[PDB]
Amino acid sequence: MKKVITYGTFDLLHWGHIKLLERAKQLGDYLVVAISTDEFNLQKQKKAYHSYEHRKLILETIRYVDEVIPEKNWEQKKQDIIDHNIDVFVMGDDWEGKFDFLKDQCEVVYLPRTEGISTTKIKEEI
Amino acid sequence: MKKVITYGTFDLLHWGHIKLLERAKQLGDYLVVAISTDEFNLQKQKKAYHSYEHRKLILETIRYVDEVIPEKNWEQKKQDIIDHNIDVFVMGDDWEGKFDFLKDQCEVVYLPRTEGISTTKIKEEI
Ligand SMILES: Nc1ccn([C@@H]2O[C@H](COP(=O)(O)OP(=O)(O)OC[C@@H](O)CO)[C@@H](O)[C@H]2O)c(=O)n1
Ligand SMILES: Nc1ccn([C@@H]2O[C@H](COP(=O)(O)OP(=O)(O)OC[C@@H](O)CO)[C@@H](O)[C@H]2O)c(=O)n1
């Protein structure tokens, strides 16, 4: 089995998030998503409108997602790969190159973001 | 096969919608979701931040959802229920009593809304 993993906040779920999860799942045959806690989201200079409990609730229902775990800190990644027998690590390309240190453990893939949509555009126009 | 159908806009999909779809599917073996077109939304004196195309895309990925069709007008219910062989019509109880005219065709049920969350709240708080 080819196991894939991706990390993120996924607040105010939109079609750009959907498209990221879609391609990620299709890079293998099982997808794990580590969703950022509200404490960690803050370490990213961000504040989620939806709570961790509710953000995880919604994401667990999306077909592409097989299971959800919490993202608590930056250092947990290498162990996550070992614990979940991960074969592919994926993120949107705004993280291009930031996680190349995991290449010696698994395949690393950066997916081009979906142009035209973001959580900032949503709040701003709303 | 016990078929269920439900109608709605589902803009800015949140946890309240998810719990409605979860309990809707719990009622039968298959769930059809008829999503309000941007044109029909106007007839309900509303305007969705997310277009139909995008609201349908995300919705289609929810595991509880087997099939999606457009809700174009108020009158299509009778014909829809016949076309899709629906056995159970369900809506959140903020619509209680409003669709009882369908009882001569199928089983009508109302589920208690999820208090504390709504599309308007998200917009006003943002
Ligand atoms: N239009 C968009 C918006 C987002 N994304 C992707 O959505 C995923 C995560 O969305 P975020 O909520 O912004 O999570 P993020 O802050 O990028 O996670 C950062 C950290 O958890 C990494 O360890 C990312 O892979 C991002 O590239 C995308 O492809 N297209
Ligand atoms: N906290 C909430 C919010 C919404 N809902 C349910 O979500 C479904 C639809 O959400 P809406 O986007 O508000 O669509 P609506 O305008 O209610 O549909 C109207 C019309 O199409 C019916 O013929 C409804 O069954 C509603 O009761 C809920 O149970 N709990």
Curated annotation (Swiss-Prot), chains A, B:
GO biological processes: cell wall organization; teichoic acid biosynthetic process
pH note: Optimum pH is 6.5-9.5.
Binding residues for substrate: 44, 77
GO MF entries: glycerol-3-phosphate cytidylyltransferase activity; metal ion binding
UniProt-reported outcome of changing residue 66 to E: 16% of wild-type activity
Name of protein: Glycerol-3-phosphate cytidylyltransferase
Subunit details: Homodimer.
Pfam families in UniProt: CTP_transf_like
Subcellular location: Cytoplasm
Effect of residue 55 to A: 0.25% of wild-type activity
Note: Proceeds via a random order reaction mechanism where there is negative cooperativity in the binding of substrates but not in catalysis.
Residues that span the membrane, as ranges: none
Domain of life: Bacteria
Pathway(s) per entry: Cell wall biogenesis; poly(glucopyranosyl N-acetylgalactosamine 1-phosphate) teichoic acid biosynthesis; Cell wall biogenesis; poly(glycerol phosphate) teichoic acid biosynthesis
Binding site for CTP: 9-10, 14-17, 46, 113-120
Keyword vocabulary terms for this entry: Cell wall biogenesis/degradation, Cytoplasm, Nucleotidyltransferase, Teichoic acid biosynthesis, Transferase
Impact noted for substituting residue 113 to A: 1.75% of wild-type activity
Predominant cellular place of this UniProt entry's protein: cytoplasm
Variant or mutagenesis effect after changing residue 11 to A/E: 0.1% of wild-type activity
Reported regulation of activity: Inhibited by the divalent cations cadmium, mercury, tin, copper and zinc.
Thermal properties of activity per the entry: Optimum temperature is 50 degrees Celsius.
Enzyme Commission no: 2.7.7.39
Upper classification of the organism: Bacteria, Bacillati, Bacillota, Bacilli, Bacillales
General function of this protein: Catalyzes the transfer of the cytidylyl group of CTP to sn-glycerol 3-phosphate so the activated glycerol 3-phosphate can be used for teichoic acid synthesis, via incorporation into both the linkage unit and the teichoic acid polymer by TagB and TagF.
